[PDB]
Structure 1
Amino acid sequence: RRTLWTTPDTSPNCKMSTEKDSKLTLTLTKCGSQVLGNVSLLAVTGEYHQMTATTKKDVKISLLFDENGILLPSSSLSKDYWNYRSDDSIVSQKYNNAVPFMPNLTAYPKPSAQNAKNYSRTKIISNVYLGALTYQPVIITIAFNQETENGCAYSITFTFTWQKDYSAQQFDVTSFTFSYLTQE
């Protein structure tokens, strides 16, 4: 099967600040040697649901995977509705190999003191927009295989960083399309 996703509902599945305070909408569609990805993030409860002037303007969502491409429980995203697509839900409560969706380790090597600088190609940096308002940019940084947390074999992280005061708003961002080279 060719799509791994969170499902497209709004049921919380993620930790921005506290457990299951947010919905990460993530779809990874296998296109041969690349995955076509689509992501967005919504705070449902907790600090990011009604930001203050002191809420930290830098949020990292970590997906850590094992040797089989299966999500580790220490990830920010819950394993419960992260699986292969079946209709607008997921195939079952199971541990299905997903190595063909994992980021290529040659393109995106793990950090190593071998070389101090990792290659910039391990990241994608762009802007998305808070509240879908054109004057409210948020930087999205997607990083591949840059985590070493908990013995992970692969990782995809999504960081959202900004400078403007978005106090008294709900964190919610426009959708972002991306791709990356896959392992096989």
Structure 2
Amino acid sequence: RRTLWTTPDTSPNCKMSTEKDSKLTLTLTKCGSQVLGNVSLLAVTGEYHQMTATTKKDVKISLLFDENGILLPSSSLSKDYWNYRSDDSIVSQKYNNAVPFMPNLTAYPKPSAQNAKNYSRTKIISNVYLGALTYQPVIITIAFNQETENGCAYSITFTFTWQKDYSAQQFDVTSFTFSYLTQE
């Protein structure tokens, strides 16, 4: 089937600062040569749930995948409810291949001295909005296959970076739609 997701609930599944302090809402829908992606992030507990003036204004969420397209346990996202869509939950089989959802390695090559440059097309950069307030931009950077750690074959990372003072607020951002070229 054609969607991988986190499920649309708010049960923590992700690490911003500490384990399971946040809900990453992520849906990847296969549309032939592209995945149509939709992402947002909410801090449920911990530092980012009530930011201070010193909370770091740069948060990277890493999804690392093996050569079958299966999420590695060293990822920021828990494997437990990351799987193919079944109703508003996931399917019962834990380890189904997902190479057709992975970012294309020719479009988005791994980091290496062999590369002529750091290719900018490996990233998407835009703004989302903290608290859905229009005066509170947060830069979202989505990067494809730019991780090498833990033997990963593919990667998708979501970085949130900002400069405005959002102390006393709960980290939560508007949803962001994107696409990327796939492997097969």
Any conservation in 2 of the 1:80–1:93 contact (CA below 8 Å)? no
Alignment gaps of 5+ in structure 2: none
User: What secondary structure, in the 3-state scheme, does the structure 1 residue paired with 2:48 have?
Assistant: helix
1:120 aligns to 2:120 (yes or no): yes
- 1:116 deviates by 5.7
Note the alpha carbon deviations across 1:75-118, whole angstroms, 9 max, x for none: 00000000000000000151010000000000000011113622
User: What secondary structure, in the 3-state scheme, does the structure 2 residue paired with 1:150 have?
Assistant: helix
CA RMSD of aligned residues (A): 0.7
Note the alpha carbon deviations across 1:130-157, whole angstroms, 9 max, x for none: 0000000000000000000100000000
- 1:61 deviates by 0.1
- What residue is the counterpart of 2:142 in the other structure? 142
- TM-score norm. by structure 1 comes to 0.99
2 CA distance for matches of 1:21 and 1:100? 30
Displaced runs of 4 or more, over 6 A: none
- TM-score norm. by structure 2 comes to 0.99
Note the alpha carbon deviations across 1:36-84, whole angstroms, 9 max, x for none: 0000000000000000000000000000000000000000000000000
2 CA distance for matches of 1:29 and 1:115? 30
1 CA distance for matches of 2:91 and 2:100? 17
- What residue is the counterpart of 1:47 in the other structure? 47
1 CA distance for matches of 2:65 and 2:92? 19
Any conservation in 2 of the 1:107–1:122 contact (CA below 8 Å)? yes
1 CA distance for matches of 2:104 and 2:44? 33
2 CA distance for matches of 1:96 and 1:68? 8
Any conservation in 2 of the 1:41–1:173 contact (CA below 8 Å)? yes
* Count of matched residue pairs: 184
User: What secondary structure, in the 3-state scheme, does the structure 2 residue paired with 1:121 have?
Assistant: helix
2 CA distance for matches of 1:117 and 1:183? 21
Alignment gaps of 5+ in structure 1: none
1 CA distance for matches of 2:92 and 2:133? 37
